[model samples]
Target: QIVVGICSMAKKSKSKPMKEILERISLFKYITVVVFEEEVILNEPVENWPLCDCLISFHSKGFPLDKAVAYAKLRNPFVINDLNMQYLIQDRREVYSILQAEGILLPRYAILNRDPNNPKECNLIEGEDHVEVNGEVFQKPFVEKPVSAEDHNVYIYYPTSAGGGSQRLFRKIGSRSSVYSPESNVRKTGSYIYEEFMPTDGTDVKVYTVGPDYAHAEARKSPALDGKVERDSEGKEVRYPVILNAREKLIAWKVCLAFKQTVCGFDLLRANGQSYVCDVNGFSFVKNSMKYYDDCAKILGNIVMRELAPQFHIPWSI
Candidate 1:
């Protein structure tokens, strides 16, 4: 039997959708699944970690990444979602850098450094109507996102022609997903990525990929639309499955291959008939889609088995 370890916080691994994936993977007779409990894994020493032929781990709030890295180093098990790449995804600048280097289409953006001691080094100036970075001016109606990927507080500033207001997008609160403010000025402190906001016609696509060959997309109303959260009968945010065009499919494949993350999710924006990748979220799975879960489990199981075949002397089997 091939032992496969799922290393993530309980908040993720214990979730219903993740549990469903695990249950399906367990159906494979030759695979034994092990879930590393958050408390146990975090508190225990790396040397005491369970041994597995393959390990799947991702970064999340309170996840002990240092320990996870140590476990990977000490155990030398095949790992999914390259642990090193996880560090790069934590920084939005790094994510953009990699995507741009790979010729991925991204929104026109610039970074403002947070240099308290050196005013010249900091690109943004207080009370400026527009931000000038490297001689390129990004006028109002642009997006201001924190350089840290975990900061979900994103702001979109609108120009006077659009009635001069700003929209704040953050994690859902109650039934609200975002809020609107009349403030037009950008925040003075903190490093941020200022990008020209692509008007997506009030919606954006979220694409989740199981591997290079399989991608599932969902379209949801943009949180910028009146700060209201649309919900279905199940209390989940309303979203509709969408088919990815050839260009979008190629983008999905490129992203998975570039990041070396077999399971991934990303935000796609289509503006003026051109698609751009706005974000890349690692180790993400679609929620509440039985077919998606089945496909994900089967594909992931096959990947694990394929990697272990040479060591175990097993034939190519699923």
Candidate 2:
């Protein structure tokens, strides 16, 4: 008998199918789903985790569930995504190097780090003018996004020479700015990346992969077709479905295999008939996840069963 733990923004809607499969197969003894109420002490470990055998994402506000998942690992809990390699997804530079080397097309980007000797001495903030890094001069209309930042922290940078008279204050894209320095959004105010801005029709492809065989993908239209964000009639953003071609699916599958991840997602961008991976997410919940839930459950459920109850069947096939 096994006790599995479920945590954070993960609701019954998402975890229910997994839970049902585990119990239906009689592979697990109990399924405990816990959602945190308020911000808890990040450093404080979950001394008494509700579950025993394994734990899933405990993600919540201000706390990366990874830390909690780490705590569970010490107790020998089975993790859905390998905790050791999980952080690699959080690092944009590492992911870039991995994907780019594997022949995955990526956008042109550069990392700007805060001066280690003197943080205040930053080339990005030193001038209202554009600064070049690694001999590449970044021009206006480029995106300035903190490598370790929230989605809304993305900004469109403009050069002073680009008819912007003066003033170092650059208007942000998603939200307005009370920002004085580009380093503000960076983790610990350290380094950030400036990616080559490719014009799109205000659409991005989001692909979700579950286990080895299942993936659900769709296209979203937010921020407007002109690369500018706009709202709709319901005051809600429109996120309809879009089909992913065979090549696109294969690309995503290869990426997941590279990372050895079970449940994750990545953002896809298309330009000139080629697709590029812009971002990769770990253990994400797809809104239409239920579409693939049964398959995922069967796969994962078989894994737990084979591991514990060897007399049962083996891992599921694609």
* Strongest candidate by lDDT: 1
Per-residue lDDT of candidate 1, residues 1-318 (tens digit): 899899999999999889999999999878899999787788999888889889999999899888998899999998878888998888999999989988999999999879788766755554435767656788887899999999999999888777877899998788887899988888878989999989887888999988899999999988874778888887888887689999999999999989988899999998889889998889998888999889999999999888898788877855
Candidate 2: stretches off by over 4 Å: 9-47, 58-60, 64-70, 119-131, 158-190, 222-236, 288-299, 311-318
Question: How does candidate 1 fare on TM-score?
Answer: 0.96
Residue pairs clashing, model 2: 2-29, 223-229
In candidate 1, which residue pairs clash? none
lDDT of each: 0.88, 0.58
Please provide the root mean square deviation of candidate 1 (C-alpha atoms, Å): 1.5
Q: Can you give the lDDT of residue 209 in candidate 1?
A: 88
Off by over 4 Å in 1: 126-129
Predicted structure 2: lDDT: 0.58
